[PDB]
Amino acid sequence: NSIQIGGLFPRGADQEYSAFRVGMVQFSTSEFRLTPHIDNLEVANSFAVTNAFCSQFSRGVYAIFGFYDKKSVNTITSFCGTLHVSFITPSFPTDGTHPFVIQMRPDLKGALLSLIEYYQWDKFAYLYDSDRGLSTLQAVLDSAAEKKWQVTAINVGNINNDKKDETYRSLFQDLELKGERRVILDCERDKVNDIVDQVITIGKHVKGYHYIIANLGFTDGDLLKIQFGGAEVSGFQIVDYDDSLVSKFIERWSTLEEKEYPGAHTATIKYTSALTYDAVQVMTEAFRNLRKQRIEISRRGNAGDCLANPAVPWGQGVEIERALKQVQVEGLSGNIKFDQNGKRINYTINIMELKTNGPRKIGYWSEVDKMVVTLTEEQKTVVVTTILESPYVMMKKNHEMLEGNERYEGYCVDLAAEIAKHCGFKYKLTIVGDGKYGARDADTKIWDGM
């Protein structure tokens, strides 16, 4: 019962492959054993993806687990669609109806928009790059048109890293101009980190700013940077470490040796790697359900050339597809179920906020219920501005020998003493710089005086 399944790991993805191997070990059974063929490639390269896919196909794999990019995703969807080979990926969900593709990553759109409605944001800034596609952008723009939102859409992906210094300073300068504080970051974690560093550098992480990170990896990255900055930060978490399953998994994960499994010694795990693990579970349960339904998907002969025209798909493929889509399992991402098209259903996205002490879950988002909230949660010297007028405020004859509020005498001085006495504060009498009461300049439109 050797089940050949191809796989595609982008060079530099280790913990994903580590969690893949861990999944291979944990979900292994005496009944059947998956026999992975791993192929490392450049994920952004369409040619490379094509070669790898046809390579896996000629090997006669029953399923393929892999990743794609905005560049390569159409190659995968089209080829998997033509040859009837099932493709399972942690990578961003495709917008449209794509057959023979099982997308492990849940759709973040609803959670994000409901989050925006939750914080009551009328106007904000949206920073995006073209990596995972512009689908979310289209979403928030259409919802902005519907709900009367004023949104600033800015592409940070087209700015070159070599020349980007003053570009972001000018960016947040233009953004500070309108007084817009609220900002949403939809980006790859690297770009996010970069933007964050630019923010702390320019000191935009101070109080009054609110950042919303759109991804499932909110606790996967380093939050210690802006943690003490004093600005509110909110985000999304697909992995709950409070769950017993995740807790035990994490114990075994932390006991693992780093030498054998790269980057596997950690307190946490990237959501992509977790999604990979859960994907292994899904495949195992799928083929298990295939064997329980007494359906033999075994290949009679070699697949031949994938490119050979006209392409002919194998029948079994459809059966394997249905097998995968009907799978419902429990995993690190929560309840795992799919619809007819292969998108995720009934997921729970934990809504989390970064506080002083650390991150905390303020609620959860459901496909039906939308946002639901979880458990609800010296003296400074008063500066007194005043002007010299008799007998309201006057300088004492000996005033050069005195200091502070003892310098001034008058009706308003005594009245100040009384007000401060009744209100119980320490007060500092100061004379206004321009020496005016108050006015609006007809030119500068600036209020001058006390």
């Binding site: 009551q120 944001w121 009328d122 009367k148 939102w149 309108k178 007084g179 609006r440 439109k445």
Partner: protein
């Protein structure tokens, strides 16, 4: 040049709204301020009355923090009242 009524109103509402946008979340505090600026830029037949008095009042009583857009959208059609006294 020549002064109008309708123009002054549409300008008034728009300038007030655009002004309150910079003050988002503290919005309920600054309505009179932004109304002042708007009266200055759009002009008024009576300096006390302002460009549109009724819109100012409606906004002042209706506006709650972060509720700006809906508040303005509801209040921008309101009668300005007499721009004399």
């Amino acid at each position: 040049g020549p002064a109008d009524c309708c123009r002054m109103k549409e300008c008034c509402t728009d300038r007030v709204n655009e002004c309150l946008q910079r003050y988002s979340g503290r919005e309920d505090k600054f309505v009179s301020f932004c109304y002042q600026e708007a009266t200055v830029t759009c002009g008024s037949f009576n300096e006390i009355v302002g460009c549109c008095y009724g819109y100012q009042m409606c906004m002042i009583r209706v506006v709650k923090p972060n509720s700006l857009s809906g508040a303005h959208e509801a209040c921008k059609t309101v009668s300005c009242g007499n721009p004399c006294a």
